[PDB]
Design a protein around this nucleic acid. Structure first.
Ligand SMILES: [Mg+2]
Ligand SMILES: [Mg+2]
Ligand SMILES: [Mg+2]
Ligand SMILES: [Mg+2]
Ligand SMILES: [Mg+2]
Ligand SMILES: [Mg+2]
Ligand SMILES: [Mg+2]
Ligand SMILES: [Mg+2]
Ligand SMILES: [Mg+2]
Ligand SMILES: [Mg+2]
Ligand SMILES: [Mg+2]
Ligand SMILES: [Mg+2]
Ligand SMILES: [Mg+2]
Ligand SMILES: [Mg+2]
Ligand SMILES: [Mg+2]
Ligand SMILES: [Mg+2]
Ligand SMILES: [Mg+2]
Ligand SMILES: [Mg+2]
Ligand SMILES: [Mg+2]
Ligand SMILES: [Mg+2]
Ligand SMILES: [Mg+2]
Ligand SMILES: [Mg+2]
Ligand SMILES: [Mg+2]
Ligand SMILES: [Mg+2]
Ligand SMILES: [Mg+2]
Ligand SMILES: [Mg+2]
Ligand SMILES: [Mg+2]
Ligand SMILES: [Mg+2]
Ligand SMILES: [Mg+2]
Ligand SMILES: [Mg+2]
Ligand SMILES: [Mg+2]
Ligand SMILES: [Mg+2]
Ligand SMILES: [Mg+2]
Ligand SMILES: [Mg+2]
Ligand SMILES: [Mg+2]
Ligand SMILES: [Mg+2]
Ligand SMILES: [Mg+2]
Ligand SMILES: [Mg+2]
Ligand SMILES: [Mg+2]
Ligand SMILES: [Mg+2]
Ligand SMILES: [Mg+2]
Ligand SMILES: [Mg+2]
Ligand SMILES: [Mg+2]
Ligand SMILES: [Mg+2]
Ligand SMILES: [Mg+2]
Ligand SMILES: [Mg+2]
Ligand SMILES: [Mg+2]
Ligand SMILES: [Mg+2]
Ligand SMILES: [Mg+2]
Ligand SMILES: [Mg+2]
Ligand SMILES: [Mg+2]
Ligand SMILES: [Mg+2]
Ligand SMILES: [Mg+2]
Ligand SMILES: [Mg+2]
Ligand SMILES: [Mg+2]
Ligand SMILES: [Mg+2]
Lengths: 171, 62, 212
RNA sequence: AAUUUAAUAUAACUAUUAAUAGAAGGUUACUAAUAAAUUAAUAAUUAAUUUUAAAACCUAAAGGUAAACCUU
RNA sequence: AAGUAACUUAAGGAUAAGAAAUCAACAGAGAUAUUAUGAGUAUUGGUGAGAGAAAAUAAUAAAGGUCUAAUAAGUAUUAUGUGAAAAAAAUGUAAGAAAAUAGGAUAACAAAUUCUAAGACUAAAUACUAUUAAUAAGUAUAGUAAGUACCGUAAGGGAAAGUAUGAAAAUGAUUAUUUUAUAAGCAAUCAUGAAUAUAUUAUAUUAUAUUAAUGAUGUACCUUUUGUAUAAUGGGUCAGCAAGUAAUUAAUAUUAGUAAAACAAUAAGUUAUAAAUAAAUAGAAUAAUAUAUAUAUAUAAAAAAAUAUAUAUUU
RNA sequence: UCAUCUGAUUAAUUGUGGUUAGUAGUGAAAGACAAAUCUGGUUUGCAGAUAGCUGGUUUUCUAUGAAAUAUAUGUAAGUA
RNA sequence: AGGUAAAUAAUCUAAAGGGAAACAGCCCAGAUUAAGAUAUAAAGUUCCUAAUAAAUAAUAAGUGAAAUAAAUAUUAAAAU
RNA sequence: AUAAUAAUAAUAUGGUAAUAGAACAUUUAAUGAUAAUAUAUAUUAGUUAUUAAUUAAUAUAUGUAUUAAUUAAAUAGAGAA
RNA sequence: UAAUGAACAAAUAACACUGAUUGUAAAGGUUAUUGAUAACGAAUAAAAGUUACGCUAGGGAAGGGUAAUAUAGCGAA
């Protein structure tokens, strides 16, 4: 026997032990990451679970309803001088049951912070995630069983994850 | 990170997909021998496959 | 994952039928079984890094040049990737900008003549130097070549002048040659040296120094 | 009017990230404790900002010792 | 190994460094402190084991530039003994200047550049600790007890231990079925009677399970060895624990992205794009495949040796 | 432990305190003792010292499958 | 010398199975898993123990029968 | 011009050191229905060419799976110190 | 067919290759040459003993074979 720290002992140390912070970072080319992102978006679109919510920058051939908005947000939430509940969560639940998606994973990609939507979807945090266009990931998109994305956010992501072309003049 | 083995660096150089070297045995005791024979001890040779692996490990960045 | 992009790492010391059991590939006994020995240690005999003599020296004054052949220039032309406005010179700045010479340019560029038989561009060219065959081909095609002298800082200013304009508001003046080798090379005419080909003041100053 | 999931305690540690800051123990006993003030809130409790009372012996340097003792 | 471990001394919330007697190279930058490239390159070594920068370009960072000194003498410099593995400012002994008409910097000299020692202050990015919030392909043997019990004169060493459940094994007694008091060896396999048990298709002349009648065969297992039943090593049994992992790199292989380009995208930078030479200012078909051309050796130039490049499209 | 033997006014035997020790004390000298044993004690750290030596290295299936020779070696238990 | 040093096979090393009574190295033959009809290798066929019937000579000593012990001596066999 | 399964002819399938393919048990992370007529664990008896899972009966706990499957990783497998 | 010795570090000459701000130098490189490591593929410029006071990690790198010797018999004389 030697010292009391030998791994072969009951109170001994552990052989070949790790020391936190363990490094598990991995790297992957940006072109491949962009291709994967396009593939995830295409998968959602092909599955018919990608919804696009936008306006005010493109020509509309059908006018927007008075009650609705052209942005991925729910206005009239901070007005809580009513009853114990207010309009935001009520409208969100009505949307939820109207479209028949209650315990289903939902993703909301936005351009800027939508505090009304965040507050209104807080009760369903277990299944609904809200992210800005900057911070979205392939795992979020692929996990979501229904993905909503604003038109400007989709424009931005498409531009960012775009194949690059120069000149390329040919017969 | 590994470091180039400077002795091998000074005695060997990279050429093509292999290494070159000088000859051994022509720095003294040359008188009395044939010049047309010692001609074979002047110049360079190439690395040998028996030690190519050793050289690759000794000169990682070459 | 895609097929052929993942394997199973060989697991050691975890059973007889695994094929890598008690010895786990080490073999039977020895220093290598339960110890560490250099891969290039050969038991005492004079090593390959001792038997042979130390040959040569490292030239710290070296100026490696990126090589550019004429076939690449002609190829860019025929691909319509050589965008030169009429009466414009193809120098190292334009080589970098167009993509003729890619990567970092430490010291300069030398034009070699590999596609000389098919080179027919009458454009003008600038570089640190060029081969004799390259000079002949460039002139035969109706072009023009001159070899210019750049230091590291001067070549940085030449390649990326807007960097200097943004950071300091001015591009540094190109430095006059100071060595003997540079002055001699760029005073040679068969090399198309810029000093001689443009009859600039430096050679005149040197001449006024000698004649005194 | 119940019953399960997911977070949260005055009641764990470790690694990282981000903020803020550079805070008594022992001995046993004549046991080693408190009191108030301020304005804005339908005789007053919001807490939080100022004031305070007590607190034996020992932990090298009022002196000495064999720590919780002794002598001035 | 290493100016590391250890001992000693002295501060503060931080300390230290800090606004050029610095880099550089004739063009220029403009204080410190960390990080990436530069780069395992220059440099260095019983030229062994090995050690190893700076310019420059980026990232973090703060308002980052300031005056407090009558501008610095036993000082610079020199000789000598030491002195961060490359790179150097301090340092024992002794000689010892100059005034910006001057001085420091390079083995030396000349020319040119650059900065002003012997006087000073300086946030922030940093280290440690303690709280608060967040995330854990972390811990119930890294999950709160206790530095206690106990061991040593002492320095010092140092335990078990939450709750509930628990047909887990080793181990003990008893019962049941079966075999066993004329038979001899790794205690098991096969062959084969007989007893017993269960069976809701045992229709039976049935099936299955347990059991040392009887017969044949059978030299425990690892290690280490040319070779072991070996009377060579290790094991009383069982339960739990016990061993190819991490970074920082180089080479090779497969697939995937892009492709004469790839990675980054602020500037840089690393591979590839041209072979060669110790190196130098040299560098690939004179209207075609080596008999041409490039490099090295030799040059009038070739020949000679060795590599390498050329037969709509550059690899 | 029992029996036997030796010194028993001394260079005697003992009590209570104190000083000298880890490159280091004491020693009528035996490498003797320094807290049940020293040719230099213990504790902690360097430290997971080093070990060409010994012993261990845990599931299954499949295909191929050796050597114990030469040379070199401060080398013959190693390594190339 | 079951010694030692090298040179040709082969086997063990790393090879189970049959024979050599038992048997790392000898004779035969190379186990993917079974089945068990046929032809077998080496070795054997009185019983233990799977499997045989004969011909021609010699032995009388249990010689011998799965590890041949010599010089020599005695007694016997035919060629001229 | 593949993949799966099956059929015919032929060759091959002992193995230490060693090399090369393939798979299973355990745990953790991502996705993830179902539910006491279910799940998990244990014993006995059967099934699949069987280190593993499954079917039946019995016993205990639980309104219940980090479940089937694909990935990523290991304090991932012990008669040998 | 023997008549021989690596690389490091020194030294001499030639070459015209590089000259760390430039110029020359210094120094390095290329070509030729010198000195022997005889344990002769050469550890370092530089190194002998003793332990019956000894310590650790390992290997064993009377029985068995042989019958030269010894003892005993036999043949021949
Ligand atoms: Mg020479
Ligand atoms: Mg000859
Ligand atoms: Mg094996
Ligand atoms: Mg061995
Ligand atoms: Mg072993
Ligand atoms: Mg080995
Ligand atoms: Mg030697
Ligand atoms: Mg006191
Ligand atoms: Mg007193
Ligand atoms: Mg300070
Ligand atoms: Mg160091
Ligand atoms: Mg001053
Ligand atoms: Mg001054
Ligand atoms: Mg000095
Ligand atoms: Mg040092
Ligand atoms: Mg000053
Ligand atoms: Mg005690
Ligand atoms: Mg009987
Ligand atoms: Mg018996
Ligand atoms: Mg042996
Ligand atoms: Mg045996
Ligand atoms: Mg026995
Ligand atoms: Mg045994
Ligand atoms: Mg034993
Ligand atoms: Mg030629
Ligand atoms: Mg007297
Ligand atoms: Mg008394
Ligand atoms: Mg003695
Ligand atoms: Mg003791
Ligand atoms: Mg003693
Ligand atoms: Mg140890
Ligand atoms: Mg150490
Ligand atoms: Mg085989
Ligand atoms: Mg052999
Ligand atoms: Mg050997
Ligand atoms: Mg033998
Ligand atoms: Mg064989
Ligand atoms: Mg062996
Ligand atoms: Mg056999
Ligand atoms: Mg027999
Ligand atoms: Mg047998
Ligand atoms: Mg007999
Ligand atoms: Mg096999
Ligand atoms: Mg076979
Ligand atoms: Mg384990
Ligand atoms: Mg176990
Ligand atoms: Mg087992
Ligand atoms: Mg054990
Ligand atoms: Mg010259
Ligand atoms: Mg100079
Ligand atoms: Mg010279
Ligand atoms: Mg020797
Ligand atoms: Mg020798
Ligand atoms: Mg030889
Ligand atoms: Mg010696
Ligand atoms: Mg004696």
């Amino acid at each position: 026997v030697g010292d009391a720290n030998s791994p072969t002992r009951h109170n001994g140390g552990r052989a070949l032990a790790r020391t936190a912070p363990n490094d598990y970072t991995t790297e992957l080319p940006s072109k491949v990451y962009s291709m994967a992102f396009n593939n995830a978006l295409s998968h959602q679109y092909k599955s018919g679970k990608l919804f696009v919510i936008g306006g005010e920058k493109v020509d509309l051939i059908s006018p927007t309803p008075e009650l609705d908005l052209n942005r991925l947000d729910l206005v009239n939430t901070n007005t809580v001088e009513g009853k114990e509940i207010f309009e935001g969560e009520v409208i969100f639940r009505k949307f939820l049951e109207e479209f028949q998606l209650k315990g289903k994973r939902l993703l909301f990609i936005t351009d800027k912070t939508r505090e009304g939507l965040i507050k209104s979807s807080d009760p369903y945090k277990q299944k609904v995630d809200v992210i800005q266009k900057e911070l979205v990931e392939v795992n979020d998109i692929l996990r979501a069983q229904a993905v909503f994305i604003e038109l400007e956010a989709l424009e931005y992501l498409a531009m960012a994850h775009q194949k690059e072309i120069l000149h390329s003049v040919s017969n | 990170l590994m470091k180039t083995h400077k002795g091998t660096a000074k005695r060997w150089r990279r050429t093509g997909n292999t290494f070159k070297r000088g000859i051994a045995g022509r720095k003294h005791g040359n008188i009395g021998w044939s010049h047309r024979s010692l001609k074979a001890l002047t110049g360079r040779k190439i690395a040998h496959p028996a030690y190519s692996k050793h050289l690759k490990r000794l000169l990682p960045y070459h | 994952p895609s097929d052929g992009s993942t394997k199973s790492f060989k697991r050691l010391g975890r059973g007889p039928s695994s094929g890598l059991g008690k010895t786990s590939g080490r073999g039977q006994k020895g220093q290598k079984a339960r110890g560490k020995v250099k891969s290039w240690f050969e038991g005492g005999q004079t090593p390959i890094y001792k038997l042979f003599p130390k040959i040569g020296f490292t030239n710290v004054g070296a100026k490696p040049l990126k090589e550019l052949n004429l076939k690449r220039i002609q190829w860019f032309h025929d691909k319509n990737r050589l965008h030169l406005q009429p009466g414009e010179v193809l120098d190292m700045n334009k080589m970098r900008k167009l993509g003729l010479v890619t990567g970092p340019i430490k010291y300069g560029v030398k034009i070699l003549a590999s596609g000389k038989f098919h080179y027919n561009l009458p454009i003008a060219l600038e570089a640190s130097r060029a081969s004799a065959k390259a000079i002949a081909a460039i002139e035969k095609a109706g072009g023009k070549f001159t070899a210019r002298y750049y230091t590291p800082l001067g070549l940085r200013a030449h390649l990326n002048p807007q960097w200097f304009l943004e950071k300091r508001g001015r591009v540094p003046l190109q430095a006059r040659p100071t060595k003997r080798r540079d002055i001699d090379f760029y005073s040679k005419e068969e090399k198309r040296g810029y000093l001689v080909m443009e009859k600039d003041k430096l050679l005149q100053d040197i001449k006024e120094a000698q004649n005194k």
